[PDB]
Amino acid sequence: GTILIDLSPDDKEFQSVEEEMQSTVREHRDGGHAGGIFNRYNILKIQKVCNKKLWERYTHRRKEVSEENHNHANERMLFHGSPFVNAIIHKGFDERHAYIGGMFGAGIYFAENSSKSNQYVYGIGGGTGCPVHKDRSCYICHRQLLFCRVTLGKSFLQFSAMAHSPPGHHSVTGRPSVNGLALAEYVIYRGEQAYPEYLITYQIMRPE
Ligand SMILES: COc1ccc(-n2c(SCCCN3C(=O)c4cccc5cccc(c45)C3=O)nnc2-c2ccncc2)cc1
Ligand SMILES: [Zn+2]
């Protein structure tokens, strides 16, 4: 029961999402192997995701987390990257399929850095690249990220050297302990704690 509302480039809501999309690009330590080499995106379209059942699922779980955390859901707007955003905008997030392990264990991954989410669009470590050119840095094929509303509540703070929640926590925060430039990543283990608000269709742009 999902509806997609295409946003005009003139809409204030379109510009504030693209802005967040463009300004959260950062240099990547891996030399762009996973997500490709680029400094900015070409936004082809942004779509608002509306689904009543999914929203109720989210707000319901949000109320429970909030009451377990001094009335603080600790809600963020985070980017999500994976090759399943097509099923997700219809079926919503589902922790049952989130068994693939990452840097911070298994679970559903989000990031403040859009370019970090871009790394996982075509699979873990970029997979084998786009289905058509097998190029992880393809400048032609379309990519899709979700700009989601996520509930973090009491989040366990994990530091890196750069599946259920920890007892008494509703999520996990992944933070670099030396590179203060890389923004945080987040992992949740309840599909109900994330709602995909926006669908961003884009291409990475080849630097000049
Ligand atoms: C294929 O390579 C990947 C790429 C991204 C993920 N992933 C995922 S997959 C997307 C979330 C889980 N999930 C699904 O994986 C999923 C797959 C197929 C159909 C679905 C229908 C509804 C809901 C889902 C799904 C769903 O919720 N979440 N975090 C990661 C991740 C990101 C970065 N590092 C580690 C894990 C897992 C595997
Ligand atoms: Zn391609």
Strand-helix topology:
Elements lengths: L2 E4 L5 H12 L17 E10 L1 H16 L7 E6 L4 H7 L9 E2 L2 E2 L1 E4 L2 H5 L24 E9 L3 E6 L10 E6 L8 E4 L5 E11 L4
Parallel strand pairs: 8-9
Antiparallel strand pairs: 1-2, 2-11, 3-7, 4-5, 6-10, 7-11, 9-10
This protein binds ligand SWY and zinc ion.
The ligand COc1ccc(-n2c(SCCCN3C(=O)c4cccc5cccc(c45)C3=O)nnc2-c2ccncc2)cc1 binds next to helix 3 and strand 6.
PDB class: transferase
Keywords: diphtheria toxin like fold, transferase-transferase inhibitor complex
Assembly: monomeric
Task: Report on the architecture of this protein.
With 208 residues, this protein is an alpha+beta fold. It has one domain (1-208): Alpha-Beta Complex (Phosphoenolpyruvate Carboxykinase, domain 3), CATH 3.90.228. The protein is built from four helices and eleven strands; from the N terminus they run E-H-E-H-E-H-E-E-E-H-E-E-E-E-E. The chain has helices spanning 12-23, 52-67, 85-91, 114-118, and strands spanning 3-6, 41-50, 75-80, 101-102, 105-106, 108-111, 143-151, 155-160, 171-176, 185-188, 194-204. A five-stranded antiparallel β-sheet has the order 1-2-11-7-3, with helices on both faces. Strands 6-10-9-8 form a four-stranded mixed β-sheet. Strand 4 (101-102) and strand 5 form a beta hairpin. The chain is globular and about 50 Å long. The structure holds the ligand COc1ccc(-n2c(SCCCN3C(=O)c4cccc5cccc(c45)C3=O)nnc2-c2ccncc2)cc1 and zinc ion (ZN). Belongs to the ARTD/PARP family. It is found in: Cytoplasm; Golgi apparatus membrane; Nucleus; Chromosome, Telomere. Zn(2+) binds at residues 130, 133, 138, 141. Residues 8-208 form the PARP catalytic domain.
